[PDB]
Amino acid sequence: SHSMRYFYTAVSRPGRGEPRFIAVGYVDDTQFVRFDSDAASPRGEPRAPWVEQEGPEYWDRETQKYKRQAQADRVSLRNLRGYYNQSEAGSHTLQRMYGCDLLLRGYDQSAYDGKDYIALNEDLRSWTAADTAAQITQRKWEAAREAEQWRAYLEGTCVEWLRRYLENGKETLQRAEHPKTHVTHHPVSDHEATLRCWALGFYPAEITLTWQRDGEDQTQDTELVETRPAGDGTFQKWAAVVVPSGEEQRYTCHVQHEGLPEPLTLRWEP
């Protein structure tokens, strides 16, 4: 129902310098921080107004942790190249996602070259290694008793600061923006026509758009584009079906969203 999530991406660059490390932090679907090792003077930078008042000590401390994490991912990428016996000529990607839900559940999982590598179990006391290489990482983290640090961060630090962030940005983070919706109509032939159901300017991003014909789902016939950012912190989505011209009214668009007290039902309105 409320979550703080961090995303790491470390990409090795053979002969084009040291690896690039990019980190972003979100509360729900609102980014509040970024770090890019390729920036001039890399440092933690606010991306939401409700962290701009945290003070220089907060931000210098965040920046220092980002730089250390960048350094560590350089060693980890080379370590991973060793595990898989990979050439130094190719680029490789180390991804990490961790965070906490409201305290409902914490998580911390990693990926190497787009595939699951290692993940902290839901009990926050052990890991699931995806292959024999990740078992090396698993054995390392067990010897360093790393599960308790993550359990300490997720059950304490993560929720404490998530609650603080939600309070500072109460006016934007805790009010859903309902989708502004309408149905458009585009003839395809003299016998068919596309009905597109729009949902615009909504927050958070989670939404469900379904077309029904005589009240039954058209999931097999519906074109559903991915939910996309508007650029202003709100999101957009649409769903479309091609209908026999003259029976448009048999089709209903149903949108579910947090910002709506009840699911909406729309038809095309000539």
């Binding site: 961090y6 980190a23 932090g25 933690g44 907060y58 401390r61 965040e62 942790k65 980002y66 250390r68 994490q69 560590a72 060693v75 980890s76 370590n79 991973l80 180390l94 961790y98 911390d108 990693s110 190497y112 590598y117 290692i118 990482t137 390392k140 983290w141 360093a144 790393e146 640090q149 993550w150 961060y153 630090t157 993560c158 600061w161």
Partner: peptide, 11 residues
């Protein structure tokens, strides 16, 4: 805030 990078916690 960021999880503290602890020493030796490389992959």
């Amino acid at each position: 805030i960021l999880k503290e990078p602890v020493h030796g916690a490389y992959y």
